[PDB]
Amino acid sequence: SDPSSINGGIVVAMTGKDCVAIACDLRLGSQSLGVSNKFEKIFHYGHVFLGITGLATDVTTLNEMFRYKTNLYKLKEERAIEPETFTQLVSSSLYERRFGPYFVGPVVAGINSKSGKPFIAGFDLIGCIDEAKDFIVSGTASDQLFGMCESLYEPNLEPEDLFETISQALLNAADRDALSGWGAVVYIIKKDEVVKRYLKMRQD
Amino acid sequence: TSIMAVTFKDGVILGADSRTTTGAYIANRVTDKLTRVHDKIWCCRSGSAADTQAIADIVQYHLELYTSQYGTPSTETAASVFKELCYENKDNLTAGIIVAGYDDKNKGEVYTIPLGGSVHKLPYAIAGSGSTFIYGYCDKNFRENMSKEETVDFIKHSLSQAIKWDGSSGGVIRMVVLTAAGVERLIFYPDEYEQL
Amino acid sequence: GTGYDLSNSVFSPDGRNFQVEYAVKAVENGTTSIGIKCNDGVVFAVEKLITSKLLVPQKNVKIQVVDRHIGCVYSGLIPDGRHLVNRGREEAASFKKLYKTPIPIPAFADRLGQYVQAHTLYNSVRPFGVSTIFGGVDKNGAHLYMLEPSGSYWGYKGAATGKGRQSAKAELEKLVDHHPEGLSAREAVKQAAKIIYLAHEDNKEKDFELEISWCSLSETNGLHKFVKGDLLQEAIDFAQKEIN
Amino acid sequence: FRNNYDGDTVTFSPTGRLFQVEYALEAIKQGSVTVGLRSNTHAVLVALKRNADELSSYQKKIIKCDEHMGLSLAGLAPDARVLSNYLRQQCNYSSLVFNRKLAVERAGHLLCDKAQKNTQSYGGRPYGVGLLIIGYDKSGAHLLEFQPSGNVTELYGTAIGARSQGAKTYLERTLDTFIKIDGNPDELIKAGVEAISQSLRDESLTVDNLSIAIVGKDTPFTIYDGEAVAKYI
Amino acid sequence: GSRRYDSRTTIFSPEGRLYQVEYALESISHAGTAIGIMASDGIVLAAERKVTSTLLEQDTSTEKLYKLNDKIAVAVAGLTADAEILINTARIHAQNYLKTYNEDIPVEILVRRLSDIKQGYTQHGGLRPFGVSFIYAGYDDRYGYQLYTSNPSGNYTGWKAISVGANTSAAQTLLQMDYKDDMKVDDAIELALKTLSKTTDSSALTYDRLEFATIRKGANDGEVYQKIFKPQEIKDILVKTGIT
Amino acid sequence: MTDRYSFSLTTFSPSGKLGQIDYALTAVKQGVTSLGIKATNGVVIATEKKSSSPLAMSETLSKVSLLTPDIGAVYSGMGPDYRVLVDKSRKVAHTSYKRIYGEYPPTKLLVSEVAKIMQEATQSGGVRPFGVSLLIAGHDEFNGFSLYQVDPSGSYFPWKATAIGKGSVAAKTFLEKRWNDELELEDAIHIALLTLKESVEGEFNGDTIELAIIGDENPDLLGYTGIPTDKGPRFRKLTSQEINDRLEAL
Amino acid sequence: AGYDRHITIFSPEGRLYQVEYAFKATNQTNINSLAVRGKDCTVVISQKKVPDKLLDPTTVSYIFCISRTIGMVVNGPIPDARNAALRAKAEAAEFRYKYGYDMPCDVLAKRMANLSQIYTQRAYMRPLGVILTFVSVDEELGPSIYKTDPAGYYVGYKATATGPKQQEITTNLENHFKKSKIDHINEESWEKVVEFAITHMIDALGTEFSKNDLEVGVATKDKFFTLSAENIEERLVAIAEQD
Amino acid sequence: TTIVGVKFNNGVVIAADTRSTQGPIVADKNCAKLHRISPKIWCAGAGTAADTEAVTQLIGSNIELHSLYTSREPRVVSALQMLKQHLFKYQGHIGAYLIVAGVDPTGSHLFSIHAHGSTDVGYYLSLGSGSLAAMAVLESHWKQDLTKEEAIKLASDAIQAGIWNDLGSGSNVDVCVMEIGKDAEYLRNYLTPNVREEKQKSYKFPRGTTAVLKESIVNICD
Numbered sequence A: 001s002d003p004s005s006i007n008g009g010i011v012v013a014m015t016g017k018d019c020v021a022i023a024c025d026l027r028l029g030s031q032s033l034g035v036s037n038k039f040e041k042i043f044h045y046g047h048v049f050l051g052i053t054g055l056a057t058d059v060t061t062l063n064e065m066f067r068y069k070t071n072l073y074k075l076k077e078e079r080a081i082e083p084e085t086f087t088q089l090v091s092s093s094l095y096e097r098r099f100g101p102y103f104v105g106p107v108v109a110g111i112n113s114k115s116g117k118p119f120i121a122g123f124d125l126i127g128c129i130d131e132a133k134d135f136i137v138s139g140t141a142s143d144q145l146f147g148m149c150e151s152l153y154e155p156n157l158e159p160e161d162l163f164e165t166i167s168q169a170l171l172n173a174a175d176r177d178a179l180s181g182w183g184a185v186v187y188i189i190k191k192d193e194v195v196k197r198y199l200k201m202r203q204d
Numbered sequence B: 001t002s003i004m005a006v007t008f009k010d011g012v013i014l015g016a017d018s019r020t021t022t023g024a025y026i027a028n029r030v031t032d033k034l035t036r037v038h039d040k041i042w043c044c045r046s047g048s049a050a051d052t053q054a055i056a057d058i059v060q061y062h063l064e065l066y067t068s069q070y071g072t073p074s075t076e077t078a079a080s081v082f083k084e085l086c087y088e089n090k091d092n093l094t095a096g097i098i099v100a101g102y103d104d105k106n107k108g109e110v111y112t113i114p115l116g117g118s119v120h121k122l123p124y125a126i127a128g129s130g131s132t133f134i135y136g137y138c139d140k141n142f143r144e145n146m147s148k149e150e151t152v153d154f155i156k157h158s159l160s161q162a163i164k165w166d167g168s169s170g171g172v173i174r175m176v177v178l179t180a181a182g183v184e185r186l187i188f189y190p191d192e193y194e195q196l
Numbered sequence C: 001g002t003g004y005d006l007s008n009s010v011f012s013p014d015g016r017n018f019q020v021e022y023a024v025k026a027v028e029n030g031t032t033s034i035g036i037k038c039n040d041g042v043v044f045a046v047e048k049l050i051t052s053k054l055l056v057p058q059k060n061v062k063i064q065v066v067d068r069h070i071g072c073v074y075s076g077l078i079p080d081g082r083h084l085v086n087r088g089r090e091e092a093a094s095f096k097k098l099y100k101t102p103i104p105i106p107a108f109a110d111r112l113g114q115y116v117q118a119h120t121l122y123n124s125v126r127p128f129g130v131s132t133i134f135g136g137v138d139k140n141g142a143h144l145y146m147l148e149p150s151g152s153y154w155g156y157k158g159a160a161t162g163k164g165r166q167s168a169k170a171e172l173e174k175l176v177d178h179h180p181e182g183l184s185a186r187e188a189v190k191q192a193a194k195i196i197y198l199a200h201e202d203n204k205e206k207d208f209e210l211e212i213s214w215c216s217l218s219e220t221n222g223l224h225k226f227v228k229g230d231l232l233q234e235a236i237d238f239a240q241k242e243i244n
Numbered sequence D: 001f002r003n004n005y006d007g008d009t010v011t012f013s014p015t016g017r018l019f020q021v022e023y024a025l026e027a028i029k030q031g032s033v034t035v036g037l038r039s040n041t042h043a044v045l046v047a048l049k050r051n052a053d054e055l056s057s058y059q060k061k062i063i064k065c066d067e068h069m070g071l072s073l074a075g076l077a078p079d080a081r082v083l084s085n086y087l088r089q090q091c092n093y094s095s096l097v098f099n100r101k102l103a104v105e106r107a108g109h110l111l112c113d114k115a116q117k118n119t120q121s122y123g124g125r126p127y128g129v130g131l132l133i134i135g136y137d138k139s140g141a142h143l144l145e146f147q148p149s150g151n152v153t154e155l156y157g158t159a160i161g162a163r164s165q166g167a168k169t170y171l172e173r174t175l176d177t178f179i180k181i182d183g184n185p186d187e188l189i190k191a192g193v194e195a196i197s198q199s200l201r202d203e204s205l206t207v208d209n210l211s212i213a214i215v216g217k218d219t220p221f222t223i224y225d226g227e228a229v230a231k232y233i
Numbered sequence E: 001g002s003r004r005y006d007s008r009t010t011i012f013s014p015e016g017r018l019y020q021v022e023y024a025l026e027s028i029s030h031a032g033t034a035i036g037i038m039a040s041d042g043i044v045l046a047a048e049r050k051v052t053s054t055l056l057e058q059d060t061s062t063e064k065l066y067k068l069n070d071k072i073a074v075a076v077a078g079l080t081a082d083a084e085i086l087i088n089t090a091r092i093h094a095q096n097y098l099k100t101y102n103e104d105i106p107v108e109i110l111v112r113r114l115s116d117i118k119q120g121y122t123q124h125g126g127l128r129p130f131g132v133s134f135i136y137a138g139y140d141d142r143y144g145y146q147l148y149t150s151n152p153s154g155n156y157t158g159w160k161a162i163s164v165g166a167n168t169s170a171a172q173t174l175l176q177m178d179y180k181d182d183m184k185v186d187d188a189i190e191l192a193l194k195t196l197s198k199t200t201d202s203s204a205l206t207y208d209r210l211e212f213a214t215i216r217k218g219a220n221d222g223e224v225y226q227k228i229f230k231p232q233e234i235k236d237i238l239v240k241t242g243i244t
Numbered sequence F: 001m002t003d004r005y006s007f008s009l010t011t012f013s014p015s016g017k018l019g020q021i022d023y024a025l026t027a028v029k030q031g032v033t034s035l036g037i038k039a040t041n042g043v044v045i046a047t048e049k050k051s052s053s054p055l056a057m058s059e060t061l062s063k064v065s066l067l068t069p070d071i072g073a074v075y076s077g078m079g080p081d082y083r084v085l086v087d088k089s090r091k092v093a094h095t096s097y098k099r100i101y102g103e104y105p106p107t108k109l110l111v112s113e114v115a116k117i118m119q120e121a122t123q124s125g126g127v128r129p130f131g132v133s134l135l136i137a138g139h140d141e142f143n144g145f146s147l148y149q150v151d152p153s154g155s156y157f158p159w160k161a162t163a164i165g166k167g168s169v170a171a172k173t174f175l176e177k178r179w180n181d182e183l184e185l186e187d188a189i190h191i192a193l194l195t196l197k198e199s200v201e202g203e204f205n206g207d208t209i210e211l212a213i214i215g216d217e218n219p220d221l222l223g224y225t226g227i228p229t230d231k232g233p234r235f236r237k238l239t240s241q242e243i244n245d246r247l248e249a250l
Numbered sequence G: 001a002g003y004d005r006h007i008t009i010f011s012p013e014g015r016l017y018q019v020e021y022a023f024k025a026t027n028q029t030n031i032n033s034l035a036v037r038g039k040d041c042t043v044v045i046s047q048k049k050v051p052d053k054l055l056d057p058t059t060v061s062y063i064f065c066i067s068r069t070i071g072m073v074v075n076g077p078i079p080d081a082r083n084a085a086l087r088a089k090a091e092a093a094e095f096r097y098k099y100g101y102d103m104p105c106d107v108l109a110k111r112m113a114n115l116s117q118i119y120t121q122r123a124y125m126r127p128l129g130v131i132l133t134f135v136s137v138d139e140e141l142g143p144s145i146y147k148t149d150p151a152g153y154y155v156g157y158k159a160t161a162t163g164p165k166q167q168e169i170t171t172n173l174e175n176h177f178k179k180s181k182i183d184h185i186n187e188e189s190w191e192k193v194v195e196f197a198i199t200h201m202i203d204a205l206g207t208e209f210s211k212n213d214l215e216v217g218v219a220t221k222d223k224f225f226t227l228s229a230e231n232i233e234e235r236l237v238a239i240a241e242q243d
Numbered sequence H: 001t002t003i004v005g006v007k008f009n010n011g012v013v014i015a016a017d018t019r020s021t022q023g024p025i026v027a028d029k030n031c032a033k034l035h036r037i038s039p040k041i042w043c044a045g046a047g048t049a050a051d052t053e054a055v056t057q058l059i060g061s062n063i064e065l066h067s068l069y070t071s072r073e074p075r076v077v078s079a080l081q082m083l084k085q086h087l088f089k090y091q092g093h094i095g096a097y098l099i100v101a102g103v104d105p106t107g108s109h110l111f112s113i114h115a116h117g118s119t120d121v122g123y124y125l126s127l128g129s130g131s132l133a134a135m136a137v138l139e140s141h142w143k144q145d146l147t148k149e150e151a152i153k154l155a156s157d158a159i160q161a162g163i164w165n166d167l168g169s170g171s172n173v174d175v176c177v178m179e180i181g182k183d184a185e186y187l188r189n190y191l192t193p194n195v196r197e198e199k200q201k202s203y204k205f206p207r208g209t210t211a212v213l214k215e216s217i218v219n220i221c222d
């Protein structure tokens, strides 16, 4: 019945010293039936990263939509879109469906290529923007994630430290959610480079 | 809500409480339910605040364009525009409106337009939840051709009773006097009308 | 160059709309019709050429009523006349429906005026081939009007158009000077019957039928009605008498 | 001159004429003759049906519009079909909605208005047909003449088509006579055939060449063709 | 009516030719020349900027070379404003295809679609055609490097080397004269510059009057890369090839 | 009624010319001279306020219009056509950009929008091209300062400096002599005044000349305080007085 | 080819003959009008000519009350003038409804000018053969005069004149202001401003006026109204007791 | 949510708390409920966040365009008329409840608009679940002829009544002052009475604590 509880999945983004991290589980189920352990919920357009939780068909559609829009943007602007701008694009694209919304919980993460400033933002299914300085959570285990983040988190963590934090927040939140888990991937983002790591976790 | 309009010797007076509720909470205690649609054509609003405001705003617009083309509209014409809007959109509106205006040839006139969109021309009219409590009182105390002072008294006493028994009515009593002399705004506070 | 008169909404080098002017020609080639404003109403009358004995007498009525208080008569292409009155009737019904009160003559005139003016704005339409005399009684008096193919119109004391408009205007101007106090409905009827008989000389070749109608606050209650029977014959005679 | 102002109906000539309309009228004159006349109890339509070859039929020229109304055509047959169909609908509407038979005078007004629209707008063309409408309503017998210009006139009798002027002068003469042929259809028809023969020249009205229609007091509009008109030749 | 002013942009001449297409091509023949040359390891696009000034900002300018996709680009000859209209819709069709199939659009599919849009203005709608001719340079995994051309008529064809705009007759003969199937991108780059150099209607062939681009598959990578040379980059390659 | 002009009014002639565009350009040529100069830290656009009567109040007519807070426009040709083009440009900057991305469009893109609108009047049914040439000057974070020209055909090009209208040929020549890639904004303003003087017949002061710049952010023209990231518009129209002050150093 | 003179497309000289011929139509009525600004009012004078004795003089006017605060005088044929008046009134009423405040004189002028610009660019629409002068005492701008023509052009004026003898009225007014050095009639009462207006009308046209030869509209804070024959007569008398 | 508006002698001030909730969970501890329609017309919004924001930006955009078209400063009554007609049309489906204030050429104004499109005027107003705690304070301390400083205090206290007594309100107090002859001043986080105490422990993990299966560099450059 509830579109945001059919497939399951979570996403969490965090800020750190000159860096940002965004992570997600890999599950895709059909209610109680696990279907795929390779359903990544993180995408990127240039240096901007987008995580999307919720109804899988919409997660796929939205990704295809934003790839489409950022591609045209780059062709006209002659530069890759920035985190701040993309966030507005996500917001207005969602509100455009105000009375027949996509059942998703988007999360944006990236570093502004010109100011080097770290950026993360969350959205509700109709575009309302939440521009947090610390962290953003989304998914069927968002309560668990808030609990994990509000405790584990602290400002200006170095990339290697933020990695341990973001991961422990993701992992332990997922293990308290029946619809999350089956694998996890974490993205560590810096001005110059981006590392992607797959975590080892319970498979039940 | 408690609103009424009364014709008298020199024209007509509109009156109303100033309460707007959202359940048992008083959202606004100094509301102005007396709205101008033309210089000497006003209305009393009851029902939905959003609907009556939207209706009034449209009527005012229609009468402004009417005036630009054919001069000052009759009170009957104003009541016809309200009627048209209320009848043709009866399924989506909750508006109980009393239209009152002063004409030099017709003097004061009162038209009441209840929920269905029907129109009724009367010597005076009462409406709103509070009105139920003063049908008897008003029917006994109303007289045609009263003086300005008498009419102000009739309305002040009637509404004070409506306000007394109806929890949906309250605040101050507002009145608007329409005569050849012009337009006059009156206001009466609790301390005065409560001890009548 | 030239060709400015081939399309309807085109301004010629001197700022004219030749198609409207050609429409006027259609009007001048038409039967004569008039209107006389009296002290509390208006009278309308028109010439009905009798093409032959085959035309049933009194049957092909030309004057038309709009709502219940407006009278309309026109000269030129008759079908264009009916077209304009149909619009007038819709215009009047729409006015009453929204405002309750029957439409004031001035207001009614601009409605016809705007509609006719509209037919001089595009080349996809042709201007109206008629001049119309209409009017009635409303909240504040009687009003007489005449509308040209250009959409132009004004309020009149007396008015005429068609074949014998000159004779008529001449006769009308006389009445204006000799009656600064105002003619009466009863008088205006007779006077009308005459002006038409006189103006009929510019077409004396064919026989005709007279038609009159009026709207008077005292004689008809402010409602438009046709002059029939005795009152009609009485005016016919008053005319036949002064035609000699 | 003319050539520059007759390319469409939305153009007035310098003298105030509408050539396309006038050319349409010319289609009527080219049409076969038909006559209409009435007394105070009946209305009759007599029409000369024209044939293409001697192997062809004589095209029908009379259409019934309702039990109390009908007409005769001269000109473009298709246009007559369009106009009569419209008249049939208007008669129908009056009956269904008001349980009232359409007044012949009202029908004339409707036709005038429908034709007028096709003379003031770009893209359309005037109707190229003439019509004679007869009917019996709440005010007795009626005869109407319809022209593509939109002009409709009520008459005691008339004729349209080629050499129509013959029958017309005859009727304008016989007037006082036929107008009193009340209570006797056969006489009215005979008078109708006498008016029409006044427009002959080529041949003489035969059995498969004559077409008659009548309506009146206790007679619903009916059409007689062939053998049925034999007793009038 | 309006018919009077209708040019009828979509009709046949007695010879079975389309007036407007023919006249649009005439228009294109006065446009700065654009050249396309396909090599075994890439494609070269070069065009001559029509009209220039000391004050024209060349660094921010682009009037002939446009990126449609990351794998397709076009050289323009004709009305720039018309070109941008088509380029924009082409950029959109490419993305629609990508979203639908999750594969970059094959070069011909995109060229055919754009040519179909053009053909439409040729058969219906009563509008003038686009005064534009395109040279498409792209790469896909079915046909590899491809070079196409489309003009106002909506017709398109594939080439090894081709030119559009002014002096194509001359330019074509020169290309047909020195082209060789086993050419290399660098050879093609040189051939293109030489060809323009001989057909230019201007004095000399300087960098400020040129736009240059290449679509290569950089060996040290494995993917396709489009390079739209910068003013200084053109100036360099211009001295190297022996034109200084 | 109903616009039945659904066919092009601009079409190709046997020679390949699009008559209506050429004629529109001719109208632009008769127009009053206007120009633009790009400096290293700003852009200036100016034109003459050719008052059509001394009774007319020249201020109530701005030839230099603000499109976005960092972009302004000026023109040469038919003023009425320019006026509606400005209304449309201000609107498209919102509907096609600000309402989507929450930020104003960069100069090149808005110019692209305007250009499209103009191109369409060259092909759509029943219309004539716009009889104007515009010069748009603006600034955006990733492109810096820029200056563009948009012609009746819809074509546009970037300039370091240029002029349009009546004495464009002469003015362009004069600009090529004084322009270099090291001009500061004040230098460009000065050069603008000198170039404009050659095109003006009568009075030449701050009441007959109209001039605006795209330069630093004017936090004083914002209208509010409290948001660090909002520093104010870069577009600023010079005052009559500011012009005169600079005319004395002419 | 020669049709570049029938519809609104450019001529080889970059001109629009239909707009030019429309300007020609504005003088068809052979009437002159002028407007001036007072200290806190705006006055508009316009010749009134009723040739036909069969006309009801009261129904012959070229001044219109667009809204409670805006007045408009038209120079051009009456049917196009009334078309313009109806549109302006509807525009004024809609503006109030949508934005919550009275449409300013200059804004209504820009709006009507834009509509005009459209007839200038779209072929199926013809320009209106009229020049519109709008007046009011704007709540933000004070006394205001804004005029629009068949070209879609519009601007504000200190004072202005329109019609066949427009030039003579204009130079007359120009001279007065070069002298006064101020941009308005420094008079406290509109009655005196009306008198000034009529006085210069007379001087410039070199003609005398009776009470039925003129038509006057006045705009003050929150109201625009036209004068009656008698209000005007009282004006004509006053000016007479000075000459 | 707690939002308020209070008129003072030479202007108007609006304030709001900064809590945003999804059910019983605090989704954002420092959202901004104060929106700018134009430089001197600001709006405080309650109800559906996406709606308050979207409606505020739409009308703000149209108001900017109207300003440019009329060459005049935007008027509060215009923002109010555009907002109410938009909200009325959607029959309450756009859950925007706003307190719109500002100064314009005609003076200083204070209004409220409900989702269904009805508007109200007053010297002091408040909307939201915290509405009652706030109004209690306002009904107790408001007086006519308040100074800018007194107004800021009243408004600020009214919001606190909500932060403390309404579970739907919390965190900080944002304020915006609009004075007749000056620039509007937006005071983001004017009050921050809810700073979290230092945690009892640091949860920084020793590097290597998390088990990793695979690792790789992500390509961003095209």
Ligand SMILES: *C(=O)[C@]1([C@@H](O)[C@@H]2C=CCCC2)NC(=O)[C@H](CCF)[C@]1(C)O
Binding pocket: B001, B002, B019, B020, B021, B031, B032, B033, B045, B046, B047, B048, B049, B052, B128, B129, B168, B169
């Ligand atoms: C009176 O009818 C009511 C008023 O709130 C509105 C407000 C302003 C003018 C129109 C009338 N309407 C109601 O719904 C409300 C409660 C009824 F139970 C009211 C106080 O009676």
Ligand SMILES: *C(=O)[C@]1([C@@H](O)[C@@H]2C=CCCC2)NC(=O)[C@H](CCF)[C@]1(C)O
Binding pocket: H001, H002, H019, H020, H021, H031, H032, H033, H045, H046, H047, H048, H049, H052, H128, H129, H168, H169
């Ligand atoms: C306040 O109205 C609420 C806020 O979450 C939103 C968020 C941002 C600005 C607009 C208002 N709205 C709510 O729905 C929520 C709970 C309602 F009971 C809230 C905290 O009161």
